[PDB]
Design an enzyme around this catalytic site. Structure first.
Site, short mmCIF file in Angstrom:
data_model
loop_
_atom_site.label_atom_id
_atom_site.label_comp_id
_atom_site.label_asym_id
_atom_site.label_seq_id
_atom_site.Cartn_x
_atom_site.Cartn_y
_atom_site.Cartn_z
N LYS C 62 61.62 59.93 88.22
CA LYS C 62 62.85 59.79 88.98
C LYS C 62 63.22 58.30 89.01
O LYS C 62 64.36 57.92 88.72
CB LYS C 62 62.67 60.36 90.38
CG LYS C 62 62.57 61.88 90.38
CD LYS C 62 62.13 62.42 91.73
CE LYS C 62 63.07 61.96 92.82
NZ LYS C 62 62.60 62.39 94.16
N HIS C 103 48.44 61.53 101.35
CA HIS C 103 48.40 62.97 101.50
C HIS C 103 47.85 63.39 102.86
O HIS C 103 47.25 62.61 103.60
CB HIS C 103 47.50 63.54 100.40
CG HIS C 103 46.09 63.03 100.56
ND1 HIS C 103 45.62 61.94 99.90
CD2 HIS C 103 45.03 63.62 101.26
CE1 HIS C 103 44.30 61.89 100.18
NE2 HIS C 103 43.92 62.88 101.00
#
Lengths: 116, 111, 116
Positions: C62, C103
Site C-alpha cells: 500500500k 499484535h
C-alpha cells in the site's frame, strides 16, 4: 517536513448502529461524491466504506491537531484512484496528504501523515 | 528526516487483568502527574487512559529502538495527547485512538 | 522526503483459517528464509509470525501505492535486525523503509513509511 500525524480505529458494529439509528448519519459524514459510492454498495461493504471514510476523516482531523474538535466532515472527501487506493480529493490542507486505510471483519483503521 | 517509527495495539481487557494482577502496575507505568489524572477517572474511561499511555510509551520505545517513569504523555488544551517528557530532543509525532475493546498508538520521530 | 505510507490490520483467526484451508498458504506468502523461522515455531506464535509478515508485506504494497493489485509476496522479505526489530531485507525500493509491527492475542497491525 512533517506537519501532522493522526490515526484512528473504528468498530464496524458502532457504524452499523449509527446508520440504523439515524437515517441522516451517512448523509452528514459523506460528501455528495462519497454518498454516490455509498449508495452503489449494499450490506457489509456499504458499512465498510462509510466506516473507512469516517476513520480517514477522523485521522485527518487529528493529524491537523484538533484533539477534541474536528474539522467539518463535509470539508473532507476521500475517493479511490484508478488502482483502488483511497486518497483525499478535498481537504483544507495544501501539502501532501499520505493516507492509508485497512480493515478486518469487525474493525477499520486509518493513518494520515501530513507533509509540507 | 525521519529517525524512528513505532506503533502499538493493546487489548483493553489485557490492561485490566494487568491492573488486577499486580496492582502496583499503574503506579509503575504512569508518572505522578499521569497518576493524578488516572486516579481521578473511573470506569471504562480510566482503563482506556492507562491502556492509552502504555500503548503510547510502547510505540515510542519501539520508535527509539530501545523507563516508563521517564516518559510522560499529557493532553493539551485541545485534548490531544503529546509527550511532555522523553529521551528525545527532536519532534515526536504521536497519535492515539481507541474503541471499546482496543487502543492503538503510532509514533514518528523526526529531526 | 516521504514517498509512501501504508498500514494493515489482520485478524489472526483469518490467517489461521487460511492456513487450515490451504496447505501451501505459508509457502506462497513466505520466502525461504521466512519459512525457516516459521517452521521452527508452533501454535499461536507460528500464526502470529505468519500474520505479521503478511501484514507487513501488505502495508508495504500500500505504501508503494500499488492499490488493490500487489507485488510479488516472494519479492518482499521481512527479517529481524541485530536490534531484534523486523525490517525489510528485500524490497523493490531503494530508499529508507520504516516498518513497525504489533499484535494482540487476536490482531496484528503493521505500519510502513517510505522515505528518500
Amino acid at each position: 517536513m512533517i506537519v501532522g500525524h493522526g490515526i484512528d480505529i473504528e468498530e464496524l458494529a458502532s457504524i452499523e448502529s449509527a446508520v440504523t439509528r439515524h437515517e441522516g448519519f451517512a448523509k452528514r459524514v459523506l460528501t455528495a461524491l462519497e454518498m454516490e459510492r455509498f449508495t452503489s454498495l449494499k450490506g457489509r461493504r456499504q458499512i465498510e466504506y462509510l466506516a473507512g471514510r469516517w476513520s480517514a476523516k477522523e485521522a485527518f482531523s487529528k493529524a491537523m491537531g484538533t484533539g477534541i474538535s474536528k474539522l467539518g466532515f463535509q470539508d473532507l472527501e476521500v475517493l479511490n484512484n484508478e488502482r483502488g487506493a483511497p486518497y483525499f480529493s478535498q481537504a483544507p490542507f495544501s501539502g501532501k496528504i499520505w493516507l492509508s486505510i485497512s480493515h478486518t471483519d469487525q474493525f477499520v483503521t486509518a493513518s494520515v501523515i501530513l507533509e509540507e
